Ligand binder design. Structure first.
Ligand SMILES: [Mn+2]
Ligand SMILES: [Mn+2]
Ligand SMILES: [Mn+2]
Ligand SMILES: [Mn+2]
Length: 107
């Protein structure tokens, strides 16, 4: 579905930080909390793709874009971060802060 890809794309392209999640998902919650800890709320969108009639289509497209169909799936300025484990690696190693600095999102 062109429609599903266009919908996913609009989420990624109109929000600097885009997180695809599902219901009662501990690593989604952890990833979102880490990002909100950088005070990124105003430029974040979280989409619950389980509460969606086209979840499988969305997951397959996210896999085409990122290599995995699992949630959370995290994009920053359209760049693929990946999942929560990828976010933790970037956070601990300074890469996340560098990304956000280059976007003007953290001083
Ligand atoms: Mn349950
Ligand atoms: Mn804060
Ligand atoms: Mn939003
Ligand atoms: Mn939404």
């Amino acid at each position: 579905s062109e429609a599903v890809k266009k919908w996913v794309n609009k989420i990624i392209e109109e929000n600097i930080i885009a997180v695809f999640a599902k219901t009662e998902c501990p690593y989604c919650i952890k990833a979102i909390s880490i990002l909100k800890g950088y005070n990124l709320n105003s430029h974040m969108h979280v989409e619950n793709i389980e509460k969606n009639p086209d979840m499988a289509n969305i997951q397959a497209y996210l896999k085409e874009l990122t290599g995995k169909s699992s949630v959370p799936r995290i994009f920053i300025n359209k760049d693929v971060v990946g999942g929560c484990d990828d976010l933790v690696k970037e956070n601990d190693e300074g890469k996340l802060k560098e990304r956000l600095q280059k976007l003007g999102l953290v001083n």
